Each structure stands twice: as C-alpha cells, then as structure tokens.
Amino acid sequence: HGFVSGIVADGKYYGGYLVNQYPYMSNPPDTIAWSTTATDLGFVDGTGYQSPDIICHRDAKNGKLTATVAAGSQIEFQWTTWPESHHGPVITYLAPCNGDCATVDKTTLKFVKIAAQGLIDGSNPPGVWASDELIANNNTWTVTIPASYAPGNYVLRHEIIALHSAGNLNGAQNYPQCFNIQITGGGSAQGSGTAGTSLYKNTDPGIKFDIYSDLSGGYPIPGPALFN
C-alpha cells in the first residue's frame, strides 16, 4: 500500500498524482502523473489483469503535463513508505504515445520493459527483493532511460508487484504508476511493446508464486522480455 508522490527526472523534481487529495477535487492541479481512483493506496490483482485498470491503475486518466529526460539519464521514483511485508519485483516500462501523451488513448499503449529487478537473496524465505532495496534507499527507485532509445513522447509505467499473498490465485498485488515523459537526445532503438491488458496472467509463474517456501528455483520476473 503506497503511491509515488513525485519523481526526479533529469535533475528536476515533478510532483506526482496525490491520490489522497486530487480525486476529492473538481479541478485538481495538472501533473505529469496519471490520475487514478486508487484512494485506498491499493492495487490491481489478477481479477483485473485484463481490465483497463491494469494499464495505469484504477480508472486512470491522462496526465496533462510531460517531463523531459535525456536518453541515458536517470529517473528517481519517490514512493510513500513501502511495507517490508510487501516483498516483490520492481518493473519499469515505456510505451510510445506517437504524439502528445496528454491525449493518447491508454488502451492503445504497448509497453516495453526497460528495467526489472526481482529476488535478490532467497536463501532465507521470504527473502530479500527489489522492494526491500527500494525501502533501504529512502523508499526510492532509480531507473536509467536507455541512451539508445528513440527520442519521443512516452508513458513511463513503474510498478511494484507485492507477492505476500501470491500463493493464492489472483493473490499478487500490482501497484502501477504512470507518468508522461519526453526522451531527448536519443538513439534509434525502440522495443516491440505488449498491450497493458496482455502484460500479466493470474497463472504466470512469477505471479502465482509462493515466497515462503524454498526459493532454490529462483524467481522468474513476470511480464514481457527486457529490452536490451
């Protein structure tokens, strides 16, 4: 349970979507972040993986602003305090808007996985995960925008998947947060993306997963192939 309160992109701070304030307003401030109705600081579980809610979280609507970021530079996501119990991977995606992200139809986005970390040390279950590294780093996560990525407008989809109840079907808890970015000073590369409602299934090996038993088999990070 948590959300992203802001990001630092190319050394500049951008306020996020303040989900405990902005839904409770007629005319909330413009942000690079997408709006959601996830006011419980909750999640999308396997019941919603083929619902448009999985794309940018519950009932999400376009952010009206866009942040610039140099290809090869870093984005830092600032989360509200993440529970240690909520062990799981941290995954980051880019989907091209092919024009202004403020007016892209979210159902048309095709996401490329540009970063992902999963199980760090499973020797003593439930083990140490990306989420735990996030906690250790002042509840922040940093990703590099590939220097080779083509300049353009993209939806940046950053997600924690908490696996503390993932042994049950539809038990994993997805926490996506979306942001509009413009990659500058890029190369020519772009991945082949996967629709938001095709990213995950409730029987995927990294989704229906028991963190509390022997982890000698590791952890297969879910979602489509990492861009190289």
Q: How far apart are CA 108 and CA 101, in angstroms?
A: 11
Is 158 annotated as belonging to a binding site?
no
Is 173 annotated as belonging to a binding site?
yes
Which C-beta is closer to Cu ion: that of 45 or that of 113?
45
Contacts with Cu ion by CB under 5 A: the residue count is 1
Q: How far is the CB of 212 from Cu ion (least distance, A)?
A: 17
Joined tokens for residue 152 = 């353009």
Is 57 annotated as belonging to a binding site?
no
Spatial contact of 75 and 145, defined as CB atoms under 8 Å apart = yes
Spatial contact of 92 and 116, defined as CB atoms under 8 Å apart = yes
According to the binding rule CB under 5 A, does residue 1 interact with Cu ion? yes
With CB atoms as reference, the residue minimizing the distance to Cu ion is: 1
Spatial contact of 17 and 34, defined as CB atoms under 8 Å apart = yes
Spatial contact of 78 and 13, defined as CB atoms under 8 Å apart = no
Which C-beta is closer to Cu ion: that of 1 or that of 110?
1
According to the binding rule CB under 5 A, does residue 39 interact with Cu ion? no
Q: Which stretch binds Cu ion (CB under 5 A): 1-9, 12-20, 50-58, 68-76?
A: 1-9
Q: How far is the CB of 79 from Cu ion (least distance, A)?
A: 12
Q: How far is the CB of 63 from Cu ion (least distance, A)?
A: 24
Beta strands in the chain (DSSP E): 4-9, 12-15, 67-70, 74-79, 90-96, 110-117, 119-121, 128-129, 140-144, 152-162, 173-184, 194-195
According to the binding rule CB under 5 A, does residue 80 interact with Cu ion? no
**Kind of pairing between the strands at 173-184 and 194-195:** unpaired
Q: Which residues are known binding-site members for Cu(2+)?
A: 1, 86, 175
Binding site for Cu ion (CB under 5 A): 1
Specify binding-site residues: 1, 86, 164, 173, 175
